[PDB]
Ligand binder design. Structure first.
Ligand SMILES: NC(=O)C1=CN([C@@H]2O[C@H](COP(=O)(O)OP(=O)(O)OC[C@H]3O[C@@H](n4cnc5c(N)ncnc54)[C@H](OP(=O)(O)O)[C@@H]3O)[C@@H](O)[C@H]2O)C=CC1
Ligand SMILES: NC(=O)C1=CN([C@@H]2O[C@H](COP(=O)(O)OP(=O)(O)OC[C@H]3O[C@@H](n4cnc5c(N)ncnc54)[C@H](OP(=O)(O)O)[C@@H]3O)[C@@H](O)[C@H]2O)C=CC1
Lengths: 314, 314
């Protein structure tokens, strides 16, 4: 019975890992809340690892936010994220935890990466300024992992998720994330008999989305591969693994699909007088597939089940 | 032995015509696949008609889709549909094909047409925006037919089918079409012991449905009438003929009937918190009946046989 610490087990991503893990008898989960354990406090973090007998660590605690937040508190996003990751990785090594899964993010790739983005696009160029501090912290996280793997022979692996969505997301039309923002918007419009819902932009830009439950499955699959197979499929200084569908879908498709999911009968409208972002953004998931993992939830299916959760929890 | 080209003979509607025609010794069927013949390519289309010695054409090829698709690719639905119909009708005339059956669609009528909708409701007012591009292409199709009939004395006839269903439909709860969407939904729920199945809406709205095999019979009956009887029953600038049952049935009736067809023992539930569409939508089929054709398949019978096909092909 392996002893698994899922840091930030109540976050969106962490809680999803916890659900799957929970049905595993070959696993004993060790969890703490932020009040039970502040991950910024090194001593505390060190004490925990020095007293709990941990075998694996899923590093899902982070200071995450939307466009307004990233732009409003840039110091918090870089600092907290650097400490949380430094504290954990270090304490783990010191207590001889040999297995860890680090979580990155698609938004760590350069602003003009070649699409679809392979793992080798990392660090190839300038970052999006809104995400820059946060990105830097994340990349630092990955390079810590590779470094310990290199110097000490540890097994600290990494996955770069695409845009995610699902239960426990922040469902506010206040949120900078389209799915939760849109699920909420179409919901309210549907309830108020809104004759239309307007979305800034042409709707032509292409994006990628992944249900958080696939993300969780993919993480555990990656964590649990044999070391030899994982090495075969990575390089020690290019160790991460993209996680996504590798499939595009326009914002228009997304919006109209959401509209249909919510039972909205008004008109979806695009205000093209508003600028679009880049035309295309998506991960190349060749590595993942080669390691034998393929996502299971259709957007359509995932959005439907995600809306019911919102319904069951508003 | 009349030489019959059924364009798009593998589509839902085309394949149904082909089945009935197949048992006719007075007919020689000429068929091509999309790879054997792209109908968007005029030259190709022209070459075909210039080398095959055709007597009748059943125009069943089209770019058809659901609500999300119509809303996501409006250019494809108007363009492809205009070309396919232009190419065929033109090549046929040029090679002296005198007989053709054009297929329209109930969704071409105005949003607020008077119910039940007689053929004279066409063009009387605004269209449903979701279907607008597609509708325009279809109406253009009909007016091409009437135009050639008028200028050149051809015999290019038209039928406007109601909502259809049957073998070879797209059976996905992913599909914007209730019968296939519901047949699939009740099937899965029945298999998973789902305690209930929820359908957005009150269930009070009235709609019309026709089994694709009746549609096929009705088309051939219409194609094969004598010109004189057909003229007697139409006007050259109001030539189409509605095809349906002319009978209403509520969504509630539909759902509960499907539930019973699939052997579902859970609860059918309506979420009236979701909006309904118009209260009533159906064709006036007085013309058809006057021309002596009356549908044969009960909804109940048609749904049963349609579910078995799905069972034999999932
Ligand atoms: N598209 C995206 O958002 C994706 C992000 N991820 C990865 O997962 C990470 C988290 O994402 P997500 O699950 O959405 O975020 P959540 O915010 O939903 O989860 C983060 C969790 O960390 C906990 N946490 C943060 N700081 C501390 C701390 N000092 N001590 C203890 N607990 C703390 C939070 O608790 P509390 O609220 O109590 O502060 C929360 O439960 C991201 O950083 C990213 O790399 C992966 C895939 C996609
Ligand atoms: N309720 C409804 O849906 C009804 C529709 N109809 C009429 O029948 C039409 C078709 O409906 P349906 O049978 O459901 O549709 P299908 O999509 O099932 O059939 C259309 C067929 O057209 C073929 N086709 C399309 N484009 C081309 C092309 N460029 N070259 C050659 N083949 C092509 C398709 O082949 P491929 O997939 O290989 O692209 C397919 O076999 C509708 O447009 C409508 O007017 C009539 C009654 C009801």
């Amino acid at each position: 019975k392996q002893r698994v610490f899922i840091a930030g087990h109540r976050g969106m991503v962490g809680s999803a890992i916890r659900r799957q893990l929970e049905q595993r008898g070959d696993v004993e989960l060790v969890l703490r809340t932020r009040d039970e354990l502040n991950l910024l406090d090194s001593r505390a973090v060190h004490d925990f690892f020095a007293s709990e007998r941990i075998d694996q660590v899923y590093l899902a605690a982070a200071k995450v936010g939307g466009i307004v937040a990233n732009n409003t508190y840039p110091a918090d996003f870089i600092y907290q994220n650097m400490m949380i990751e430094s504290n954990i990785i270090h304490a783990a090594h010191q207590n001889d935890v040999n297995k860890l899964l680090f979580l990155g993010s698609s938004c760590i790739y350069p602003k003009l990466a070649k699409q679809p983005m392979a793992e080798s696009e990392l660090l190839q160029g300038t970052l999006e300024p809104t995400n820059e501090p946060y990105a830097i912290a994340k990349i630092a996280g990955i390079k810590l992992c590779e470094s310990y793997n290199r110097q000490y022979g540890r097994d600290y692996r990494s996955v770069m998720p695409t845009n995610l969505y699902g239960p426990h997301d922040n469902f506010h039309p206040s949120n900078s994330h389209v799915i939760p923002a849109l699920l909420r918007r179409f919901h309210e419009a549907t309830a108020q008999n809104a004759p239309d819902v307007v979305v800034w932009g042409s709707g032509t830009p292409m994006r990628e989305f992944l249900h958080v439950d696939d993300m969780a499955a993919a993480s555990i699959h990656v964590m649990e591969l044999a070391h030899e197979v994982w090495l075969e499929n990575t390089q020690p200084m290019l160790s991460h693994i993209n996680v996504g569908t590798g499939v595009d879908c326009t914002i228009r498709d997304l919006a109209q699909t959401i509209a249909k999911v919510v039972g909205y009968k008004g008109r979806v409208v695009f205000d093209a007088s508003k600028p679009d972002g880049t035309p295309r953004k998506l991960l190349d998931v060749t590595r993942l597939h080669q390691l034998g993992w393929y996502h299971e939830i259709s957007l359509e299916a995932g959005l439907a089940s995600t809306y019911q959760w919102f319904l069951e929890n508003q």
